[PDB]
Amino acid sequence: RTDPMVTLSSILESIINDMRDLPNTYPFHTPVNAKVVKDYYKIITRPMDLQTLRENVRKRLYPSREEFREHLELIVKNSATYNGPKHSLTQISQSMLDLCDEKLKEKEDKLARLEKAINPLLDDDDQVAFSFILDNIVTQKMMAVPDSWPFHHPVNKKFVPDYYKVIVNPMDLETIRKNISKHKYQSRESFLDDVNLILANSVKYNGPESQYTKTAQEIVNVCYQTLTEYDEHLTQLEKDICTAKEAALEEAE
Numbered sequence: 404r405t406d407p408m409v410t411l412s413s414i415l416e417s418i419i420n421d422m423r424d425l426p427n428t429y430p431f432h433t434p435v436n437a438k439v440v441k442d443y444y445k446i447i448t449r450p451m452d453l454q455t456l457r458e459n460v461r462k463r464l465y466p467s468r469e470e471f472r473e474h475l476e477l478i479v480k481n482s483a484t485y486n487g488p489k490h491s492l493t494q495i496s497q498s499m500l501d502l503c504d505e506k507l508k509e510k511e512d513k514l515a516r517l518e519k520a521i522n523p524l525l526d527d528d529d530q531v532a533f534s535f536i537l538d539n540i541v542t543q544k545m546m547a548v549p550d551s552w553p554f555h556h557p558v559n560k561k562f563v564p565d566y567y568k569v570i571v572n573p574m575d576l577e578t579i580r581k582n583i584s585k586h587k588y589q590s591r592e593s594f595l596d597d598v599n600l601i602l603a604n605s606v607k608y609n610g611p612e613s614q615y616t617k618t619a620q621e622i623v624n625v626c627y628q629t630l631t632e633y634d635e636h637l638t639q640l641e642k643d644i645c646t647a648k649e650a651a652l653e654e655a656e
Contacts, residue, residue, distance in 0.1 A: 407520035407655045408463055414514065415460045415471050418506045422475075422499040423453050431478055431496055446485055451477040453499075467518040468507050476500055520655035523648040530586050533640040536633060537594055538583045541576055544625045545598075551576075551618055554601055570608055574600040576622075589648075590641045591630055598626050 423432055433454045435443045444450065451474050465471040479496045486492040507514065524530040546555055556577045558566045567573060579597050588594040605619040630637065 404656055407517045407652065408466070410655075411465070411467075411514070411517045411521065412460050412463065414506075414510060414517075415465060415468070416457060418503055419453055419457050419460070421506060422502055425495075425498055425502060427495045428453075428499060430492060431482075431499065443485060447481045449477055450481060451475070453478075466521045468514055472500075472503065472507070475503055516655040520651040523651040524586060524589075524644065527644070527647060529640050529643040529647065530589070533637070533644060534583050534586050534588070536637065536640070537588060537591075538580060540626055540629045540633075541580055541583070544629045545622045546576055548618060548621050548625060551622055553615060554605075554619060554622060566608060570604050572600060572604070574604060576601070589644050591637060595626070595630075598623055 422428065431452055434450060434452045435447075437444055456471075456474055456478075459465065459474065460471070465474075479493065479500050482490065482493045482496045519525070545551065554576055557573060557575050558570075560567060574597050579594070582588065582597065583594075602616070602619040602623045605613065605616045609615040
């Protein structure tokens with residue numbers, strides 16, 4: 404039904420409107436003009452204002468109130484650094500953060516519902532356990548294939564100078580491991596898409612009968628064979644991962 408990120412962005416956008424409506428807050432509505440305050444950006448490394456904050460909300464940069472409030476408190480931190488810790492402008496910027504925390508407390512439970520629907524696998528040990536199993540299939544089985552090392556890392560353009568001009572979607576075992584650590588794979592199908600892409604790239608570049616294609620084929624065979632070996636436990640984790648995401652979306656509805 405409803406996209407939880409859209410609902411969260413409308414709450415955050417509303418909060419920006421309320422802070423912007425507070426009196427004397429104009430110096431924080433828009434970025435500091437470097438042509439007027441010519442030494443400002445020599446002091447403030449991370450500038451922030453209400454307009455930039457609204458631009459970040461509309462581009463869906465904040466998955467929760469935590470990242471949103473972090474950038475908002477930066478407005479108070481920057482004015483404390485430039486104008487002073489107890490300057491009048493820092494007090495005004497603090498009144499914006501005070502009203503924000505008041506609005507976040509009012510919608511405390513709907514925000515928690517929305518953030519869980521946006522990041523369902525946050526602290527979910529089923530996703531970590533599933534990722535861990537996939538990583539072991541790579542390191543214990545696929546990387547153990549004899550002479551598989553050319554597939555362990557991205558192709559080195561220094562020695563294969565035309566590879567990235569021919570292969571549009573390169574894939575390797577390190578890139579898959581990095582995807583695993585990021586929990587990109589919620590089931591074994593997306594994982595197998597990248598594994599099979601390694602073999603298809605070797606078929607295209609090295610040729611169907613090349614020694615490297617035969618090694619990549621064995622990398623694929625041992626991966627399917629190991630997934631078959633762990634099929635029951637993987638199905639359990641895949642079930643719990645998928646149902647956790649759907650339940651979060653239902654609770655946020």
